[PDB]
Amino acid sequence: MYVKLISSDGHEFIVKREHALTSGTIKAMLTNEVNFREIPSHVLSKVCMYFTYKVRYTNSEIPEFPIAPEIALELLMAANFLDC
């Protein structure tokens, strides 16, 4: 039901399995635990919020998805890697 995503700085993010399958890369992985040696906390947290935001508002007026310009490049790289 839930999967555990681990960041490079050792944070664990417990997300619903169905939400995490928004990522094509993660969907290719799947135990209940995926390790990311290259994605830091402040990026992986946003990635997780994206999963939920997408599942909820896909086929919904859609509110903005907030991204600080300071995290955007790292987020871009992460999202590319994650295929989402």
């Binding site: 508002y57 919904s60 998805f65 955007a72 987020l75 871009l76 999202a79 989402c84």
Partner: peptide, 16 residues
């Protein structure tokens, strides 16, 4: 209504 891919959203955030 369709949610943009995170790659697109992240790039749009670099444009701003």
């Amino acid at each position: 209504n369709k949610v943009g891919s995170l790659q697109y959203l992240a790039l749009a955030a670099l444009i701003k």
